[PDB]
């Protein structure tokens, strides 16, 4: 199937902190596999999935020293952004980065990513051509011009097409899974003359899933309540969707569960 790598990086300043905290989290196929945190007693990239312990000490020493460089890059960048936005001393500020590459099922590069946010809002991103930058804010154009003048994107294009794909291939080798939903309906009467059917889906991975309720053969988009998909904490996820029905008519309501691990969608009903 398709594959990906991402590094999510955060630098955080708070008024009661002299220096920013820097965190970098690496992902392969949307699961964390390495993490660097400057708050640690001895900061270093650390393995976060057992298959990563395969890597030797000079891997970790090299990644760790890059992270120390990135930490300083974020510090300087947070200081410059403060001036760009005419923000004074004495607030909390955040710089975020996501970067990485998407691979098709043939393991070829589909797309590389490099995006930044300041205060949780889009600041500047490398466009899909890996050659030009998009920046919305007036304050952001200062960065775009600098990076255009320095030709920074050339180095980023080379990473996203080169090392990002090459090392992602190495990682997919070293760690060479879906779990299907298990579904049931629970019965809860909301009032006299009405009943809530709750369709649960439990124990599934990946997290993406869809639950619907159908009348005859009628999807009921509004009127139906749901929860955001949530981690069970064991690696799997959960969701439910519920709808209010006249009692006795429970049998004319069918729930459907859509998930990429299923041979076909599940259909189910309340079972006395």
């Amino acid at each position: 199937g398709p594959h990906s790598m991402r590094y999510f990086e955060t630098a955080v300043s708070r008024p009661g902190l002299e220096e920013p905290r820097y965190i970098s989290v690496g992902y392969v196929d949307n699961k964390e596999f390495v993490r660097f945190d400057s708050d640690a007693e001895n900061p270093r990239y650390e393995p976060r999935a057992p298959w990563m312990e395969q890597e030797g000490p000079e891997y970790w020493e090299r990644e760790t020293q890059k992270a120390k460089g990135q930490e300083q890059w974020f510090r300087v960048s947070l200081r410059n952004l403060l001036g760009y936005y005419n923000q004074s001393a004495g607030g909390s500020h955040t710089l975020q980065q996501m970067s990485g590459c998407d691979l098709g099922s043939d393991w070829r590069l589909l797309r590389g990513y490099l995006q930044f946010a300041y205060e949780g809002r889009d600041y500047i991103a490398l466009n899909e051509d890996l050659k030009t930058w998009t920046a919305a804010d007036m304050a952001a154009q200062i960065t775009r011009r600098k990076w255009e003048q320095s030709g920074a994107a050339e180095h980023y294009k080379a990473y996203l097409e080169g090392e990002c794909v090459e090392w992602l291939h190495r990682y997919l080798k070293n760690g060479n899974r879906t779990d299907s939903p298990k579904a049931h309906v629970t019965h809860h009467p909301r009032s006299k003359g009405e009943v809530t059917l709750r369709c649960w889906a439990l124990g599934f991975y990946p997290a993406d899933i869809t639950l619907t309720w159908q009348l005859n053969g009628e999807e009921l988009t509004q009127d139906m309540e749901l929860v955001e998909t949530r981690p069970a904490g064991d690696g799997t996820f959960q969701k439910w969707a519920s709808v209010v029905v006249p009692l006795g008519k429970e049998q004319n309501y069918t729930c459907r569960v859509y998930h990429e691990g299923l041979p076909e969608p599940l259909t189910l009903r309340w079972e006395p």
């Binding site: 955060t10 989290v25 909390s92 975020q96 949780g120 629970t186 981690p231 069970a232 904490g233």
Partner: protein, 99 residues
Amino acid sequence: IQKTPQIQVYSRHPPENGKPNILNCYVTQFHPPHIEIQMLKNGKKIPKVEMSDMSFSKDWSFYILAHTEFTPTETDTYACRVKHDSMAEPKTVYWDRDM
């Protein structure tokens, strides 16, 4: 600007009274990432609460999972209390075994 934490409180496994289980407090969609999360039993802080590490989603918002061992009963109330700068008051979400 500040984004208001969304909170869910729910058990890892289908709850059975008297049977050990794991209670989760899942907090999403907040910004800035600084946040305080407490889990309560009958209004009392639960001593050891495990806390996932700082993470954020594609839309840039942060999320964290807090969790702790618990044994549900018919009458005990479990809650998650969250303090975040987007809110003038802490927000408490109470565990509902049906949700």
